[PDB]
Amino acid sequence: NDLCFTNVYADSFVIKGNEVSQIAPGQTGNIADYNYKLPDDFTGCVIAWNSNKLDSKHSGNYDYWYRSFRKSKLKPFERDISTEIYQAGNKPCKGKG
Amino acid sequence: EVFNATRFASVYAWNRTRISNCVADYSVLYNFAPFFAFKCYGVSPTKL
Numbered sequence: 001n002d003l004c005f006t007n008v009y010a011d012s013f014v015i016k017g018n019e020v021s022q023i024a025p026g027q028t029g030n031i032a033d034y035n036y037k038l039p040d041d042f043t044g045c046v047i048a049w050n051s052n053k054l055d056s057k058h059s060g061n062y063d064y065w066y067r068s069f070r071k072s073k074l075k076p077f078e079r080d081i082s083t084e085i086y087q088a089g090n091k092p093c094k095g096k097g
Numbered sequence: 098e099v100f101n102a103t104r105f106a107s108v109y110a111w112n113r114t115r116i117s118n119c120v121a122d123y124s125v126l127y128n129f130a131p132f133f134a135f136k137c138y139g140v141s142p143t144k145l
């Protein structure tokens with residue numbers, strides 16, 4: 001409360017518990033490499049609180065997503081919203097299975 | 098042959114294999130496992 005910040009970015013995303021400890025400057029994992037990479041010299045804070053009342057219901061809910069397959073690592077502070085079938089082997093395959 | 102195995106030995110007797118006289122393209126290491134912890138220490142995994 002006694003500092004001054006030229007600008008402040010607030011990135012919000014619900015995510016599983018282990019990924020909370022995954023989210024940190026200079027880490028690894030399916031999220032830290034393909035979904036959200038925090039740059040090394042990061043100046044700020046992370047906030048994580050439990051929300052089982054807004055992300056849950058009877059019969060289940062599957063609205064949330066994540067990316068476990070990307071052609072390369074995600075650069076710091078970049079978004080990669082894309083639905084491209086990952087290539088395995090040498091097939092130009094465009095489909096699921 | 099070390100990622101296609103079926104009886105990965107228990108930790109008390111850790112199977113140790115030696116890799117030599119070969120060309121190591123770690124794409125074949127990447128395709129055989131949807132990784133969970135690729136924490137590299139001596140070398141950055143991209144620079145492999």
Ligand SMILES: *[C@@H]1O[C@H](CO)[C@@H](O[C@@H]2O[C@H](CO)[C@@H](O)[C@H](O)[C@@H]2O)[C@H](O)[C@H]1NC(C)=O
Nearest residue numbers: 098099101102103104105106111112113114
């Ligand atoms: C660790 O496990 C490897 C895969 O099973 C073994 O490599 C192979 O082992 C078979 C016999 O199971 C050999 O016929 C083959 O040539 C290859 O070496 C490896 O020996 C094993 N190592 C130890 C120390 O258990």
Ligand SMILES: *[C@@H]1O[C@H](CO)[C@@H](O)[C@H](O)[C@H]1NC(C)=O
Nearest residue numbers: 098099100101102128129130
């Ligand atoms: C192991 O090799 C068999 C060969 O038929 C292959 O079908 C299978 O996908 C391989 N699995 C792993 C984990 O290497």
